[PDB]
Design a protein around this ligand. Structure first.
Ligand SMILES: Cc1c(Cc2ccccc2)c(-c2cc(Cl)nc(N)n2)nn1C
Length: 449
């Protein structure tokens, strides 16, 4: 069976949530369901990135980095897929996986995901941290007529965010509501100081219990688990056949440079690079009260302006995330123009000005950093995404969190701009979660007072 159709190559970049959805054209589009979430933290990715930028790697740092990274990450992807999970998004530091099922089946599926989680630790006993959560989940699709983006929002997402914070290497942390819905007859835990979540230590099954027949029964509730003649496939998406209408909407989720490579109009090795870029990390904060029904329209309206300003200054959206009531856009400049830095700052300020006027948006924060970052396709053959990794990526992320409400930039961006100093204001250097002295940070003030 021939399976190398463009539509299949596009499907590799997307979860089943998008590939087999049937959304309206409306934007925003919301849907709601229940499932289990898995967040896998990889620690080392960013640290090793600066290692591979050394001259020891003789200008093959990027090629070597993506190779060793994909060696580990595709092993994590395989475990997730064979246990029936759907990988939603990759980022330099992590991936998020989803098991969407009927509410009545969450108890059984949590045991599946916990088992999955421990086999993933088994791969590296180079370490990871895993948080799990279960409950209600909302899906947000937004974009314009040629571009689409998605997010999962809700308690379960925030739950998996908190279980994220506590885990150390080799941990598997269950959110409180995941502990309350799980099969406690089977999961031995230990509590977390000043927390309602729990750490998992062992999965002790009843004597009669046989996981493989149990797992096979759970697949009954997994609409898209490969079976029958397709039991040896990792993804049913490998079996997609040409369908112009479906490919039309799927390609909107994928960056045009990726589509070029999918279309064999570009060297397949052209996208793994250690490249100078400017990262513009835009954070849109909402209040605790705000529910998904009100969030989606604000992000849509923010996104509509963001994309038009980015196209003007020649930037792209690399990744969209959301947690802790903040929706963040990882935007990249380069991958290049002579005065990239000035254009990055002016793009930030414009974004800051318009978005701060969208209502339901309580706060806009934007971090800007510039340097060498790894850019590449990360994941497994059947499930992968273009992704940027590097210390400058983490800096822009921590700046927009530690300096809310303003536009911040780093020392590299500050000196390299063609704008004069008084457009900036040097800031008090705060200590941040994994910052080996930033260097001097600045507020982009603007042209006048
Ligand atoms: C780091 C990362 C995130 C942000 C995130 C971090 C911790 C808990 C929950 C979300 C997402 C993500 C994906 C989707 Cl589809 N929706 C939302 N809301 N977030 N994916 N990845 C790889």
């Amino acid at each position: 069976e021939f399976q190398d159709w463009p539509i299949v190559r596009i499907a590799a970049h997307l979860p089943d949530l998008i590939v087999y959805g049937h959304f309206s054209p409306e934007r925003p589009f919301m849907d709601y369901f229940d499932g289990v979430l898995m967040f896998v933290d990889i620690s080392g990715f960013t640290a090793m990135t600066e290692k591979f930028s050394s001259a020891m790697y003789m200008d093959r740092g990027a090629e070597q980095l993506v190779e060793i990274l994909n060696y580990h990450i595709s092993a994590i992807v395989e475990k997730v897929l064979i246990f029936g999970g759907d990988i939603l998004k990759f980022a330099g530091d992590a991936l998020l996986a989803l098991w969407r099922v009927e509410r009545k089946q969450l108890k059984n599926i949590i045991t599946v995901v916990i088992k999955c989680s421990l086999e993933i630790h088994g791969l590296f006993e180079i370490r990871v941290k895993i948080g799990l959560a279960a409950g209600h989940i909302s899906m947000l699709v937004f974009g314009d007529e040629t571009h689409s983006h998605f997010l999962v929002i809700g308690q379960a997402v925030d739950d998996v965010r908190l279980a994220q914070n506590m885990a150390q290497m080799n941990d598997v942390i269950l959110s409180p509501n995941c502990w309350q819905l799980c099969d406690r007859s089977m999961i031995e835990i230990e509590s977390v100081p000043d927390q309602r979540a729990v750490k998992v230590n062992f999965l002790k099954p009843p004597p009669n219990f046989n996981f493989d027949e149990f797992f096979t029964k759970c697949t009954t509730f997994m609409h898209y688990y490969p079976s029958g003649e397709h039991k040896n496939l990792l993804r049913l998406a490998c079996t997609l056949k040409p369908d112009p209408e479906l490919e039309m909407s799927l390609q909107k989720y994928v960056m045009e440079s990726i589509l070029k490579q999918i279309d064999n109009k570009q060297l397949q090795g052209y996208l793994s690079e250690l490249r100078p870029v400017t990262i513009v990390f835009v954070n849109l904060m909402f209040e605790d009260q705000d529910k998904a029904e009100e969030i989606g329209p604000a992000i849509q309206d923010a996104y509509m302006h963001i994309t038009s300003v980015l196209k003007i200054f020649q930037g792209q959206i690399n990744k969209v995330f959301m947690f802790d009531k903040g929706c963040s856009f990882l935007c990249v400049f380069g991958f290049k123009v002579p005065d990239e830095l000035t254009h990055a700052l002016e793009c930030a300020m414009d974004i800051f000005d318009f978005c701060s006027q969208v209502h339901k948006i309580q706060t806009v924060s934007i971090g800007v950093a510039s340097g060498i970052v790894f850019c590449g396709i990360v994941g497994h053959t059947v499930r992968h995404e273009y992704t940027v990794i590097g210390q400058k990526v983490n800096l822009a992320a921590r700046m927009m969190m530690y300096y809310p409400g303003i536009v911040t930039c780093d020392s590299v961006t500050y000196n390299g701009s063609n704008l004069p100093a008084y457009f900036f204001k040097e800031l008090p250097k705060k200590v941040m979660k994994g910052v080996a002295d930033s260097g001097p940070l600045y507020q982009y003030w603007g042209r006048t007072e």
